[PDB]
């Protein structure tokens, strides 16, 4: 046990009183699989959401094909962009772009912008040092991007480039102001992810905070904010307490000048910590429904960070805590991105519950 | 046995290797008294910077004196502002008034502003009702205070209430502002106190943010910046990080409109601290002075919060942790508070140590 629904519903979690902080494990177990599928299609969130799919976890392009109508923006994680030599730019993983898959989704869900995301791969001090330092250079690198948008029909890309050097940027900041205006020329869309702009456990500001906000906003199309992953294995606690994901927004663009064009991240995927070994394990929708029917634990809402966690014990490994996501913890965060009128990302649409598209 | 200077010296302690990293506890006892006599009337800071006195500690009074040249203003901490009845208002502590030390102050530092620090006590939710409702009420309270300062020779006041209430939050800005414009009627100052705006070990915004300081800024002459108390007793550690500071400022004015009108607060006392105990105890100069002498201790300096602690074992008590302020952890955030526009506010001139003045 414990029983499993398989059937489809009529109406959706919201209107079926499903959205409560008194959770017991039986009732997720239950309903996850049921989602309303006569209204797939209509959308309950009004800002912009953007949703990533990963090959390794397949799930996640079915989920696509079937919700399709309540995302804005589709990304999904196949390439990279890598420096070969000088003025030599290189788009790998092209091999997973999946022409048929993308022609599917794009079928059921008209206006849905396809933006896989490119990131920036094995780039090295003097990479970036020659690269953003030379117009010529940047000007090769945009060429390269914009034609496998062209060749292979994306409607655009996710850029991850930010952290992902760790140098400190005027100098990052106008590459990307560029290639943003050679992919709009092209009729293409240019969306950047950032980190927190305060940063974990700190009180402190990170590397992409309103300086760097206020440079790009009025240029790019979306800004994929990581508001997740807020906790650690040596420090288990909650993904993305609510009010650090409220200010993490206030704090990048506290006049309200560019909100839609803040993607309010949100994580399908939960943790799950073992405190003894001061070690953590992601879990996906599989593993948690399996881990509630292995112990039937209780679910504990914190209020504050407004999330579920649970413990159990394993025989080897010990005491373990649990932060997976709930139609609650997530219904708050849809609420707090309309209050903060801001859009909404989600990593990654093939680890969550398939009910959870009800709320979107 | 350690070897403490008396005398006063020609240079400053910044023109004498004297502002390091790397500290000697003996070089703390054997220079803190020796400041630069010379110089005392010469700036080496060129924002405002507001020092506070307060009565139990009675070598600030002192300190005004030698040093008052290198302050913009003063605020006595001897009043406090009660509300007696309907439209009833009275200003207590006129006893600790001194008129002579504020005739003796000005006459060394010309151009040195008083603004005694007049702190909301004993109101109740309803005065604050009754009051914040009112236009005759603030009317009244407005005419109080303004007969004081008027009467006591007062060039305005650092008003300390915003923590006592923030729930309407609006009603409170009202009267501020009709306090602030009688104020200035009168042509006298206006200052409030204002919390962090990043609140201590919780990753979010407090209650006073740039949404308050967007509609108090135009109409209040300063803001005295609580940036300082960042530890607490179960969690020992410093007073106030250097980004933690910085992200306050820039987290209150964005947009840099008012940065000359921030008062960054700077500690001149610091905290001692009982690893196991979970408790602490403020320490001022004196105190600070003597710990050194009786144990002798490594000073190790923090270079992620900027700021040099030390420690010391009493059987009697336990282990102990102590955090203070060095010319260094105090050159730096003046170096800050120079690269934010901002001014400075010392709490406060009977804690510290006489050389620190040499810095401003």
């Not at 919201?14 to 996850?32: C, M, N, P, W, Y």
Request: glycine share 6%; net charge neutral; hydrophobic share 40%.
């Amino acid at each position: 046990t414990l029983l499993e629904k398989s059937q489809f519903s009529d109406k959706p979690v919201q209107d079926r009183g499903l959205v409560v902080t008194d959770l017991k494990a039986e009732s997720v177990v239950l309903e996850h699989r049921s989602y309303c599928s006569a209204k797939a299609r209509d959308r309950h969130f009004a800002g912009d959401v953007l949703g990533y799919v990963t090959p390794w976890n397949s799930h996640g392009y079915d989920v696509t094909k079937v919700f399709g109508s309540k995302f804005t923006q589709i990304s999904p994680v196949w390439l990279q962009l890598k420096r070969r030599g000088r003025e030599m730019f290189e788009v790998t993983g092209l091999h997973d772009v999946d022409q048929g898959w993308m022609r599917a989704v794009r079928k059921h869900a008209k206006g849905l912008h396809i933006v896989p995301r490119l990131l920036f791969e094995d780039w090295t001090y003097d990479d970036f040092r020659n690269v953003l330092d030379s117009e010529d250079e940047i000007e090769e690198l945009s060429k390269t991007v914009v034609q496998v948008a062209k060749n292979q029909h994306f409607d655009g890309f996710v850029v991850e480039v930010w952290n992902q050097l760790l140098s400190q940027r005027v100098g990052l900041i106008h590459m990307l102001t560029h290639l943003a205006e050679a992919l709009h020329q092209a009729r293409l869309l240019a969306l950047l992810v950032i980190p927190p702009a305060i940063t974990p456990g700190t009180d402190q500001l990170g590397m992409f905070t309103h300086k760097e906000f206020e440079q790009l906003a009025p240029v790019l199309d979306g800004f994929s904010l990581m508001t997740y992953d807020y906790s650690t294995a040596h420090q288990p606690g909650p993904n993305a307490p609510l009010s650090w994901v409220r200010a993490c927004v206030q704090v990048l663009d506290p006049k309200s000048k560019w909100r839609s064009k803040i993607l309010l991240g949100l994580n399908f995927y939960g943790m799950d910590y073992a405190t003894s070994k001061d070690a953590r394990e992601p879990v996906v929708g599989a593993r948690y429904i399996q881990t509630l029917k292995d112990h039937r634990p209780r679910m504990v809402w914190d209020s504050q960070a407004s999330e579920h966690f649970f413990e159990y014990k394993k025989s080897r490994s010990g005491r373990h805590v649990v932060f997976y996501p709930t139609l609650k913890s997530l219904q708050v965060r849809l609420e707090l991105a309309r209050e903060l009128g801001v859009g909404v990302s989600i990593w990654e649409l093939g680890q969550g519950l398939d009910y959870f598209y009800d709320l979107l």
